[PDB]
Design a binder for this molecule. Structure first.
Ligand SMILES: [Li+]
Ligand SMILES: [Li+]
Lengths: 35, 35, 35
């Protein structure tokens, strides 16, 4: 999978990176630090 | 989430923006350029 | 982190303070007003 966020990164939060697998690995993958 | 830094911006560093999700998205969100 | 510019301040611009996290927080940290 490419290392990108698929939604605008202003819509990504630390809460969602900890609590949501889909935010952490898909919507906000890059800014959550997965890649 | 509002576009602010929650710690003083003079404690935010590029290192923390690059290497810490919580700095990049929460403590230093604005000054890291997330929003 | 010390409040200094790590490049000569004559190379620092408002545009780089606004649009680049590394200039804002590192290269031009002092002249950009981060500290
Ligand atoms: Li997120
Ligand atoms: Li600059």
């Amino acid at each position: 999978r490419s290392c990108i966020d698929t939604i605008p990164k202003s819509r990504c939060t630390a809460f969602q990176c900890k609590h949501s697998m889909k935010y952490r690995l898909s919507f906000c993958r890059k800014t959550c630090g997965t890649c």
